Structure formats: C-alpha cells, structure tokens
Point group: D2
Chain length 251, copies 4
C-alpha cells in the first residue's frame, strides 16, 4: 500500500482493459493516478470508484488535449513521476492488399505518435522528479502476427523508441521501459473475437496459444508496471514480456 | 555471374551509397536492375556505367511515382522477382525536446510508408514469380541510438513489419527478409560526420565502434542482399545483421 | 512485508554478493529463506542477523549435498515455493588459447549442472506448491564478453535451459524465469578488479559501461527476484535484464 | 564454382545429414574439404563421390583424434581457412525427471566441448589465413523446446560461445559465426520420428511448424555456410536463422 506512495502517475487509455488494470495497481500502491481516456464512460466510473484516481478527458492524438493533460496534472498534484503510454488500438485482421496508407497513418498517429507527444511534453517534469516512462507495446512487435502489418509496425516502433529514449534520458536519471503483453483478456480482445466466423473457437485458440493455458489478466500487466516504476531502479530500455510463454517453442 | 540470371530487381535509393552497392552486386549476379531514386545525378551515371541497369526517377513517398515505377518495370522487363527497399534518411542528431511531430511524420513517410507502398504494389507480381522482398533496416532499430528517437522508431517499425509480411506472404512462397547494417561508409555517413564539431573524431569513433575495427562497405551489404534473394530459400522473416560485431560486448 | 508471506525460498550462493541481496529481499517480503553456500563465513552471519533465514552448508556441485539440502528444507519448513539458482563463478580473464577443457568442465559443473541438479530434485515439491524457479544468468550470455569463452558459454546455457524448463513445467503451473544482471558491485567484481593492472581504472570503466553511470546493487537484483516469485504470475521463460542499459547503443 | 576456390575447409559430422550438405556446398564452391566423422560409412562414400573431399576418421570428443585431424589437414593441404563445427546429437524426448547428470555431461562433451576443442586447436592456423569458424547451433537454443533440457542447454551454450569467440578473435581478422537451423530433414530427424507413437503424424507436424510449410534441406544450410565463409566479410558473432519462419508468430 506504500511502495509508490506520494507519487503521481498518468495512464493513457485508462478507462478499460489493460489501462484500467494499471490504474488499479497504482492506486493500490499508494499513488495518485490521472486516468486519461477519450471515452468518458469507463474513466468516469473509475474515478468515482477509486480514492486517489481522477479522470481527465483527453484524446492523445490531439496535441492540444495532451498539453492540457500535462498542465492540469501539475496544477492539481504538483508533480509528475510516471507516464504509462497504454492507449492504442488493434484493427480487425487485414491482408496486406486490404490495408491502406491512410489507415496506416491513422494507426501511427494513435499507437506511436500519441506516445511520443505525451512523453515529450512530460519530460521536463519527469527530469525534475527523476521519474520514469512505461510504454505498452506488444509481443507481436517482436515476433510478428498475421493479417496485421500496420499494427505490428507500430508496436515495433514503440519498442525501439523506448530504447532510444532510454539512452537520451539516462543522464537525467529518467528510466524508460516497455511492457510487451501477449494475449490479455480485455474488451478489445472480446470485440475482435466477435468479428471472427467462430468467436468461441478464436477465444479457445487464444487461450491455448500460451504454455500456461490461459490468457493474462489486466491486473498482471498492472503489477509489472508498478514493479518497473517503483522497484526496477537499474532497469532502463528493457522490454518486459508478459505473455505466458507464447514466444517459446514451436507451434 | 549467373546466380540470379534472368531475374528482375528493383532497388530504391539505388543512386549512391548502400543502394548503389546493392545495384552493382545484383548486376554482377546476372540480374536486370531498375535503379529507383529521387535524384538523377547518381542513378543516371550508374545506368550508363552498367549493362543491365536502368534508371527510373521515382520519389517513393509519392504514391503515383511508385505506381508508375512498378508498371514501367513490368512493361520493360516482363516480370519482377525482387524488391529492395533501401531508400531512407538519417536526420542530424536531435535531443527529444528538439524533435517535432511534423519531422517525425515526414521521416515515417520515407523510411516506413515508402517501403510499405512499393511492397504492396509489387506483391501481385512477386506472388506470380515466387519472388522476395528485402528491406534495409538498421542495427539501431534493435539496440537504440542516442539523439535519434524518430529514426530509431522508423527502423524498429521496418524490422517488425518484415516479420508480419513474411507471415502473410508465406502461403504464396514469397519470402520477406531484412538486412540491418551497422556503420557503413556512405555519403550519408560523410554528410552527418561533417556536421559534427570534429568530423575526424566522429569518423574515428565510428570505425572503432566495431570489433573488426573498420566500417562496412556497400559491397558487403550488396553481397548479403544477393544471398537473401538467390540462395536463402528457407529464410523468411529474418533480420540479417551486417555490423562488424558492433552489438557484441560492453563498450 | 507480506507479498511472499508464508512461502519458503532456497537461495544458492546466498552468503555474499547478489545471493545475499536476494536473501535479504525475500526475508523483507515475509518469506522463510534457506541460505545455501559452500562457505560458512557469510552465511552463518546472515542467519544470525536475519529472523527467518537459516544456513545450510551445501556445495551445489556435490549431488549428495543437494539431496540433503532439499530434504532438510522440507523437514524444517514443510514446503518449498521458490528456488533461486545464484551460485556461480567468473574466472579471471583468459584468452581462448589460455583456457583448458578441464577448466571448462569444472565451470560447467558449477554454473550449469549445479543449477540443473537442484532444480531437478526440487521439482516434485515445486509442482505441489505451484512454485517457481529463478535462475541467475548474465547479460554476457546474450551479448558476449571478451576473454571469457567458458563463462559466456555457461551463461548462454543457463538462459536457454530456463526456456526449456518453462515449457516442460508449464502444465503443472510451475514458472521458470531467469535474471540476467550486468555489472553489479559484489565481492566477485572487487576480486576480479584487483587482478587487473589498474584496478581503479577497471572499476571506473565498469561504472561507465552503463548509461545510468553506476553499477547495480545486490538489492536491485533482489527486488527483481521477489517480483518474479510473487507478482509475475503470467511470466514464464523470460530473461529479465538488470543491466542499467549496458546492452543499448554503440560504445 | 570459384567463390571459395583454393581454400581448405574442415566439416565435422560431415558424413550425412546437414554436414554432408555443407561438404557438398563447399566442394561446389571450389574448396578442398576434409570430412570429419566418427562413422566411416557415409564419409568414405562421400570421399569417393567428390573430387576435392577427403575423409579423416575422428571422434571430436577425443582430444587426441582432434589433434591428429588438424595436423593431418595441414600436412595434406598446407593451410586451413574454415572450420564448420556441425557434429552433434539430439537425444530422444525426455522429461526433466527422466534426464541424468551423466547424460547431460555426455551431451556437453559432444555438442559443446567438441566444438570448443577443434576451434581452439585450429585457431593458430585460422589466424594465419584470416579464416573463419562456423558453428551449427539450433533454433531451440534461442526459443526452447519441450522434453529437451540438455540439448537446449548445449545449443544455447554454442550460440553464446560464438559471440565470445568473435570478440576474442576480431583483432586477428578471424570471424566466428553460427547458423541456427530449424527443422531440417536429415537421418537424425527420421530416427527421432521413428521413436514416436505415430511417426507419420510427427513428420506432418514438423512440416507444418514452419510458415513455409516444408522442412529445410541440408543444401540450404550448406548455402548459408558458404555465404558466411566466402562473402560475409563484415559479419562476425551473428546467429543466422535457417528456420523457414518457425520462430514467427503464435502457434
Ligand atoms: N489486449 C491484448 O491482448 C493486448 C496485447 C498486447 C498489447 N496490447 C496493447 O495494450 C494496450 C491496451 O489494450 P487493451 O486490450 O486494454 O485495449 P482496450 O481497447 O480494451 O482499451 C484501450 C483504451 O484506450 C482508450 N483509447 C483509445 N484511443 C484513445 C485515444 N486516442 N486517446 C485516449 N484514449 C484512447 C480506449 O477508449 C480504451 O479505454 C494497447 O496499446 C494495445 O495495443 C493489448
Ligand atoms: N550508412 C549507414 O551506416 C547505414 C546504417 C544502417 C542503415 N542504413 C540505411 O541504409 C539505407 C541507405 O543509407 P545510405 O547510407 O546508403 O544513404 P545515402 O543517403 O548515401 O543514400 C540514400 C539514397 O536514397 C535516395 N533517396 C532518398 N530519399 C528518397 C526518396 N524519397 N525516393 C527515392 N530515393 C530516395 C537518395 O537520393 C540516395 O541516393 C537507408 O535506409 C539507411 O537508413 C544506413
Ligand atoms: N557480480 C556481477 O557483476 C555479476 C553479473 C552478472 C551475473 N552474475 C552472476 O551472479 C551470481 C552471483 O555473483 P556474485 O557477483 O554475487 O558472486 P560472489 O562470488 O560475490 O558470490 C557467489 C557466492 O556463491 C557461493 N558459491 C560458489 N560456489 C558455490 C558452490 N559450489 N556451492 C555453493 N555456493 C557456492 C560463494 O561462496 C559466494 O558466497 C553468479 O551466478 C554470477 O555468474 C554476477
Ligand atoms: N536436423 C535438424 O533438424 C537439426 C536442427 C537444428 C540443428 N541441428 C544440428 O545440426 C547438426 C547436424 O544434425 P543432423 O540432423 O545432420 O544430424 P545427423 O545425426 O544426421 O548427422 C550427424 C553426423 O555427425 C556425426 N557425429 C556424431 N557424433 C560425432 C562425433 N563424436 N565425432 C564426429 N562426428 C560425429 C554422425 O556420425 C553423423 O554423420 C547437429 O549439431 C544438430 O544439433 C539439426
Ligand atoms: O488484440 C489482439 C487480438 C485479439 C484477438 C485476435 C487477434 C488476432 C489474431 C490473429 C491475427 C490477427 O490479425 C489478430 F488481430 N488479436 C492482440 C493479440 C496479441 C497481441 C496484441 O498486441 C493484440 O492486441
Ligand atoms: O547514418 C548513420 C550515422 C552516421 C554518422 C553519425 C551517426 C550518429 C551517431 C550517434 C548518434 C546519432 O544520432 C547519429 F546520427 N549516425 C547511421 C549509423 C548507424 C546506424 C544507422 O542506421 C545509421 O544510418
Ligand atoms: O564478474 C564480472 C566481471 C567483473 C570484473 C571484470 C570482468 C571482466 C571484464 C571484461 C572481460 C572479462 O573477461 C571480465 F571478466 N567481469 C561480470 C561482469 C559482467 C557480467 C558478469 O556475468 C560478470 O560476472
Ligand atoms: O532433431 C530434431 C527433432 C526431430 C524430431 C523431433 C524432435 C523433437 C520435437 C519435439 C520435442 C523434442 O524433444 C524433440 F526432440 N526434434 C530437432 C528439431 C528442431 C531443432 C533441432 O536442433 C533438432 O535437432
Ligand atoms: Na476518485
Ligand atoms: Na545500363
Ligand atoms: Na536466522
Ligand atoms: Na575425394
């Protein structure tokens, strides 16, 4: 209840799914948490539920929204210790010939440039607090995925950008790390499965893709984020896999 | 002189540097080569020098230029066997606070989306020939680089996209691989060194960054490309490091 | 003080250095800890210092010592939840022509087979508790090191064996992970530096090999071990780098 | 027919399987090849079949056999340019509790120490010729395999040792690289499948484990070896995956 007491955390895409799991984990560790989301429904409910969490409406693809998010966080809480760049989207499966440059650009705006913009605007405050950045990437940025060229590209970019930023910010003592989850049961996973010819089969396949035989939970990604923020003081530029072993062995 | 005889190769950014080394390597292996570049000076000279190479002016960031490039290649040579996505740029060193979203988007257009667009438009012809794609990424997409957040992100994206495309195109027998060079002596390396306070020191540091104690040559990247195209028939989705050992050990 | 309360942990090589840091971290998290070491001096003092730690003399290269260690742990505490295979050694720098097959075999016995034997003998008890194994490998197993062929080979083996064991034990819910530290200030680091022509220069070089500009502490490896044991329930077969960024960038 | 003309290559385990594919590839590239094997049947036939290959009976686990192999190679051909450490074995599937320390030591002697001993004894001659070493590791050293703890450990060691040796030998211009094959159809693969309850099913599963939908051929590993020896002059310490994409994606 005190391993990150007194610290201030911003979580983007914090209204549901992995982001909400990360919000809950940080509140339980004593932090004050700003929930950033473009959708009010989940984030407003979480603010009512959790002592120590507040909701700020913010679309991370809009530069002016992000400037306001950072200024409001400082105005309300006086410091900024950790930014968790979790907002992102996985489009439905698309063969390469079905993708468009336009759709690719739109996905880059969210999955990559939104993470870049918030990080850049937060860095002056993180340097003052010797804070840290946690990016949520994906296992498929490392090993690939079928029917997902744009998504995979965006997550390969996030993982690489994490390492570049870690080098740049190391003189200030600011650590920059990423978490690469595998299959985590979230509303996004459910929405994508619902598009498949047999959703039940897709979900079963998703559970069996891991040697541990289940999907991961948002709380498990949340615990990894709290570790990186609060206890991983000699870790920077790492990719922490939270995948249940999916990358291991033949299949 | 015959290991890729009768095949047709498109090399983007083929007018100088690594691209010109790749052009030369494929001509020497018996292929017909289309040199694609936005600058006429180097590419026109190479077309005059090399039997079996032709120059087509094409800016890979302009979709209509790329459509013309592909249609002209088929009209002139009747087939397409290999696309080498080499065109790209490394901006001068920039701290994170010195970068802009605008500059990041422009670099994504060249280093990532140009590679995507040509690949997508070429795939119908590569599927007919059971051809292959070779992307030129960078070691720093894997290990990071200081003062280069946008560049590193773009190359992490290219390496990841290679793996995604390999999965998608495997049913057709089309292989998709990337080469990740380290320090290669090219006009880009020379231009970036010239911006440094002491260019001579920068070049010396660049040579000593490799255990082999020198920078690589364009011809060495070219030989790796010919191997991937002509002899690596069980390789798809790989990242071939051509770095002189730079990623090894402590420094 | 309760994140691993009621659990029983065995730490090999627990009498000094990283191992002692891991012992302390687990005691502080509420666990009962068996300190295994071949040297009495450090381990006996730690047993007197720490409520909840006990010392058992055990050379992990002697199969009968390890059988006794496991049987005594069960007899005294009734369960076994976590094995930390930390015992190991780094010989002085040796060029390849200076190494011997005999010395290589001896190092394999300690760094690899000692980890194998304890793990194998503990698995029946770990399967009953749905416990976990943590192996201490090394960054140099992944990226190499000069003048250390046998050591590097042993640590590459440990990291790979971790992934194999994770696959085998996943049906039982037993997780198997490794930590790969970089430069950590320990008595081993001090002893190796003392052999160098200029120890002070060697230590300075060791601090500057990390972007964070210092060496790591045993407590930092200890915190990573507690995370893997207590909170990383969807992680198996991972390599957690605790290196201060040493593997990033050029040098 | 001339890309490695006039050079002398030693291939261990060259009498069948991948090793014989490597022998054939080097003979076809103009090299003189010493076939080293502990079994006469395949190697003697290959010597009769191939102009430019000779067979020397040698068990790489016996230090005196290896000393003779090196001295005879120099006596007969006057130089040594490339050593290919291919000899190795994969035991039948074994759960961890079914393995023994004794069997693990025996496998280390072959798969790891045999490679070490020949390399060490050859290095004085490779330094004179600015030659190179090619180790045959395995994809499963990188990603794990079930029911194969000892094998996986030995191949993780070989891959890591490759990187260490590359660092040590770089001042002499001697390159050290490894090839990590995936499923390659060889007599070993056939012998292991024959032990399975349904060999036909095991083989079908083995073909479908790769996105390319087939197993690899010895000739394909051979072509990769010739590339590394003859044309990869800026590559040292690399792991070249020859796997058909098996490590990509979910399964
Ligand atoms: N679910 C998985 O299996 C999985 C696996 C690997 C990686 N990831 C990554 O984890 C992250 C979260 O995934 P999830 O499954 O929880 O998704 P989700 O769709 O359930 O939740 C994403 C949240 O982000 C918000 N969001 C979307 N666009 C936004 C924007 N422009 N500005 C602000 N908020 C925005 C959404 O409103 C939503 O509340 C993503 O980056 C995703 O790529 C997910
Ligand atoms: N030089 C190195 O050390 C190095 C290292 C790693 C990776 N790389 C990569 O290798 C590739 C080539 O690098 P280089 O050093 O040879 O660079 P270079 O600048 O010497 O050559 C690049 C060529 O691409 C052309 N080009 C640029 N933009 C283009 C566009 N829009 N359309 C068509 N052609 C275009 C240029 O006119 C030029 O002829 C790049 O992708 C770079 O990121 C280079
Ligand atoms: N110190 C570093 O920078 C560093 C870096 C990476 C990995 N590591 C790894 O971390 C581990 C611990 O290293 P350290 O620096 O703390 O070393 P250390 O020498 O300070 O401590 C090692 C401990 O293990 C014990 N030990 C040795 N052989 C043993 C045996 N046969 N049976 C039982 N106990 C035995 C020693 O008595 C000692 O107490 C090793 O596996 C090492 O390879 C260390
Ligand atoms: N076949 C595969 O799918 C596969 C996959 C990955 C890696 N590998 C590796 O490739 C190598 C060759 O495998 P393969 O499938 O061709 O095996 P194989 O059993 O068909 O051939 C191995 C050869 O090595 C020889 N050999 C064995 N022990 C020896 C010793 N002590 N001294 C000298 N020669 C000895 C054998 O007599 C035989 O001719 C091995 O290192 C193996 O681990 C194989
Ligand atoms: O959200 C998903 C997800 C959910 C359901 C199906 C799929 C899916 C499965 C196979 C091919 C595809 O193109 C898919 F989109 N993916 C996801 C999965 C892994 C890693 C991730 O980062 C993710 O976000
Ligand atoms: O072109 C370069 C290059 C040339 C000269 C200096 C630098 C340089 C050195 C340190 C920090 C930086 O931000 C740099 F831009 N880079 C390059 C280097 C490695 C990998 C590549 O992909 C490349 O393109
Ligand atoms: O203990 C060491 C250590 C301590 C002091 C010097 C060296 C050292 C430095 C350069 C070349 C060598 O061969 C060395 F042995 N190593 C160590 C370092 C990194 C990773 C580890 O796993 C370790 O254990
Ligand atoms: O030889 C084999 C091989 C052949 C047939 C079955 C298996 C097999 C499949 C699943 C689990 C196991 O424990 C196995 F031994 N392996 C092999 C395969 C991949 C990589 C290699 O390096 C190899 O040598
Ligand atoms: Na609240
Ligand atoms: Na011409
Ligand atoms: Na005690
Ligand atoms: Na012969």
């Amino acid at each position: 209840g005190t391993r990150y007491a007194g610290k201030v955390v911003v979580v983007t895409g914090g209204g549901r799914g992995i982001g909400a799991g990360i919000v809950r984990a940080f509140v339980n560790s004593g932090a004050r948490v700003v929930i950033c989301d473009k959708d009010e429904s989940g984030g407003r409910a979480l603010e009512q539920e959790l002592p120590g969490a507040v909701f700020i409406l913010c679309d991370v693809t809009q530069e002016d929204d992000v400037k306001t998010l950072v200024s409001e966080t400082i105005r309300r809480f006086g410091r900024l210790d950790c930014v968790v760049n979790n907002a992102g989207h996985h489009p439905p499966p698309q063969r390469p010939e079905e993708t468009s440059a336009q759709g690719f650009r739109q996905l880059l705006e969210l999955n990559l440039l939104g993470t870049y913009t918030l990080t850049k605007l937060a860095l002056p405050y993180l340097r003052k607090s010797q804070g840290n950045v946690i990016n949520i990437s994906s296992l498929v940025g490392a090993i690939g995925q079928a029917q997902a060229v744009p998504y995979v590209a965006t997550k390969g970019a996030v993982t690489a950008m994490t390492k570049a930023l870690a080098l740049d910010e190391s003189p200030y003592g600011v650590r920059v790390n990423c978490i690469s989850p595998g299959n985590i049961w979230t509303p996004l996973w459910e929405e994508l499965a619902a598009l498949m010819p047999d959703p039940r089969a897709t979900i079963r396949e998703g559970m069996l893709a891991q040697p541990l035989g289940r999907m991961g939970q948002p709380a498990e990604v949340g615990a990894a984020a709290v570790f990186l923020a609060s206890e991983a003081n000699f870790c920077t530029g790492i990719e922490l896999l939270v995948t249940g072993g999916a990358e291991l062995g033949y299949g």
